[PDB]
UniProtKB/TrEMBL annotation:
It catalyses: a beta-lactam + H2O = a substituted beta-amino acid. The gene is blaL2. It is an enzyme of class 3 (hydrolase). Belongs to the class-A beta-lactamase family. Residues 26-242 form the Beta-lactamase class A catalytic domain. NCBIfam families: bla_class_A (NF033103), lactamase_L2 (NF000232). Pfam families: Beta-lactamase2. One of its GO terms (molecular function) is beta-lactamase activity. Its EC number is 3.5.2.6. This is Beta-lactamase. GO terms for biological process: beta-lactam antibiotic catabolic process; response to antibiotic. PANTHER family: BETA-LACTAMASE, BETA-LACTAMASE-TYPE TRANSPEPTIDASE FOLD CONTAINING PROTEIN. It comes from Stenotrophomonas maltophilia.
Length: 270
């Protein structure tokens, strides 16, 4: 594994990085002050996997703005709802959880059962797609439930986005005026508190940034990370999306590839 590891660390642009892991890599780096973008395969489709959960949460918050106390509503967690990956909801089987706490769980731990329970609250994948369209996104689409949404076939557009589309959507929804102020700050905080991306984009970004992110992956070859970068010294934020498919390297090496995107982007911003 040493030669592949070395080739990954020596890569200093996104095309070289793609080559070092023999993968397909999609990246957009977006400056929110100017709208300038730089990257790789910015307009090709990639499977979203769990990165969609950021916008599922946004759909819920948007519905709460016109249905008072929805976030305080309690939803039963039944034995039949449980999946293999359910780190938070597993403790609550046979009782219930607030809608708000389900949102937190699905972002910061990627809880699959939490996500399916929230789909039921808002009206399923068509409800999330409709929120996306209303926000200005003409590209991203939510089609299936967990865990089927992770099964991507080449040329199948179900449950996909592009690096450029998702970057723009992060700006409008996390930084813009698609949501009310209290709603978007709550979404920002959940992303900042994420616990699954320590070895991904965060591992290559310097201390001058405060990062919020959401990861994704599947068992075959996909590993993704999308992030918002706030400069702690002040100024406009940046947005960084990274989608990777690379079946010839290990799951761990996929994370190393993501970390290297972080290092290259940080040097490009300068």
């Amino acid at each position: 594994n040493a030669p592949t590891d070395a080739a990954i660390t020596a890569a200093s642009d996104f095309a070289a990085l793609e080559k070092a892991c023999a993968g397909r890599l999609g990246v957009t780096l977006l400056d929110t002050a100017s709208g300038r973008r730089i990257g790789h395969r910015q307009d090709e489709r990639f499977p979203m996997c769990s990165t969609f959960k950021s916008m599922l949460a946004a759909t819920v918050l948007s519905q709460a703005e016109r249905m008072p106390a929805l976030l305080d509503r309690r939803v039963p967690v039944g034995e039949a709802d449980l999946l293999s990956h359910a780190p938070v909801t597993r403790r609550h089987a046979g009782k219930d959880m607030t809608v708000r706490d389900l949102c937190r769980a699905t972002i910061i731990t990627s809880d699959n059962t939490a996500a399916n329970l929230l789909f039921g609250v808002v009206g399923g994948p068509p409800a999330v797609t409709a929120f996306l369209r209303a926000s200005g996104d003409t590209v991203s689409r939510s089609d299936r439930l967990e865990p089927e949404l992770n099964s991507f076939a080449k040329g199948d557009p179900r449950d996909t986005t592009t690096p450029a589309a998702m970057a723009a959507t992060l700006q409008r929804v996390v930084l813009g005026e698609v949501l009310q102020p209290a709603s978007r700050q709550q979404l920002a905080d959940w992303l900042i508190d994420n616990e699954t991306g320590d070895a991904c984009l965060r591992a290559g970004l310097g201390k001058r940034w405060r990062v919020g992110d959401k990861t994704g992956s599947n068992g075959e070859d996909a590993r993704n990370d999308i992030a918002v970068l706030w400069p702690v010294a002040g100024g406009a934020p940046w947005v960084l999306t990274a989608y990777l498919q690379a079946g010839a390297i290990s799951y761990e090496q996929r994370a190393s590839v993501l970390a290297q995107v972080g290092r290259i982007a940080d040097r490009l911003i300068g």
